[PDB]
Design a protein around this ligand. Structure first.
Ligand code: NI
Length: 341
């Protein structure tokens, strides 16, 4: 049944709760972002009000064929009224269209639900600074001190410099980047920009990107694979077998592949610096795992929480095991004691 951490007390509201059938008493279903674990269950047959960002409403209409009369897009950083309750959507620094939701409850409580986020100091100067938050429903994906990673900027710098070097040394190399959901668009867009190519991709991916209000997008992407030297593939296909195959398909236009797999965290972060990353190589194929995250590091999450000073924390990730739940509760207590709230 619908877990308690997807319910907002004192409202008729749920967050990312589309796979439980009709949730008894729910009058409005909020969707924080278009990733499958969060939208799972939506279709053209959905007949309840959905509240989301503009970008997420574009993807609902065009990819899942949700009927227009049930999509209620709201502008960011704007006080809005929903079934009698004041709400504000804030940028989550996750994938395109991803939001946090502030609820101002009739009784005076103030709840922030982060959806999925990468905490950033820039958040400390949004509408959040204006009032106190009693309850924080928190994206705890990487809530453990081993999870360190570089800034997005340092990782993109690494990818650009790597790709440019390779193709300038061999003008017949192909660059390939893996994807399986929206998010991490900067990786492939930044590489294509330095090389003076568009990014080539399936029709279904092209459609998805055209929903995202990215400026100048028609200049950056294409479905003509033959005209492009940066190709996007399903993540699954980013291995020596799927890449050898792909190379065959290009008909001797190319004699080398350099591939990028932008993962979440991986254990080489505990030891290695971005400067020091190396590919796995087989023949004329090289694959780079690069730690491009769109979730908070442990330290970024800790700063955000110690700034906000919530009275209660409700984790929304890693909640399925007792050891995970108990370890996270121990970090929350350390943070509150170190900061004094
Ligand atoms: Ni997500």
């Amino acid at each position: 049944t619908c877990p308690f951490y997807k319910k907002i007390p004192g409202t008729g509201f749920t967050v990312d709760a589309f796979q439980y059938g009709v949730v008894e008493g729910c009058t409005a279903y909020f969707l924080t972002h278009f990733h499958s674990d969060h939208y799972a269950g939506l279709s053209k047959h959905f007949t309840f009000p959905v509240y989301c960002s503009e970008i997420t409403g574009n993807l609902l209409k065009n990819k899942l064929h949700v009927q227009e009369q049930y999509i209620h897009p709201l502008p960011l950083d704007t006080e809005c009224i929903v079934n009698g309750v004041k709400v504000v959507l804030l940028d989550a620094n996750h994938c395109p269209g991803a939001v946090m939701i502030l609820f101002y409850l009739p009784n005076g409580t103030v709840i922030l639900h982060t959806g999925d986020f990468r905490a950033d100091p820039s958040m400390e100067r949004s509408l959040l600074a204006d009032q106190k938050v009693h309850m924080l429903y928190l994206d705890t994906t990487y809530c453990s001190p081993e999870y360190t990673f570089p800034s997005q900027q340092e990782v993109i710098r690494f990818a650009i410099n790597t790709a440019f070097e390779a193709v300038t040394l061999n003008p017949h190399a192909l660059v390939v980047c893996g994807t399986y959901s929206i998010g991490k668009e900067k990786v492939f867009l930044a590489i294509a920009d330095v090389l003076g190519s568009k990014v080539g991709m399936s029709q279904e991916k092209y459609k998805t990107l055209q929903c995202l209000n990215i400026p100048e997008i028609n200049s950056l992407i294409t479905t003509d694979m033959c005209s492009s030297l940066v190709h996007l593939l399903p993540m699954m296909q980013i291995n020596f077998k799927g890449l050898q195959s792909h190379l065959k398909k290009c008909g001797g236009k190319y004699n080398q592949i350099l591939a990028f797999r932008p993962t979440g965290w991986t254990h080489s972060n505990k030891f290695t610096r971005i400067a020091d990353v190396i590919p796995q190589t087989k023949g004329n194929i090289s694959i780079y795992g690069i730690p491009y995250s769109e979730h908070s590091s442990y330290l970024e999450m800790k700063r955000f929480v110690q700034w906000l000073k919530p009275q209660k924390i409700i984790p929304t990730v890693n909640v399925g095991t007792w050891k995970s739940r108990s370890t996270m509760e121990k970090y929350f207590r350390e943070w509150k004691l170190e900061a004094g709230y």
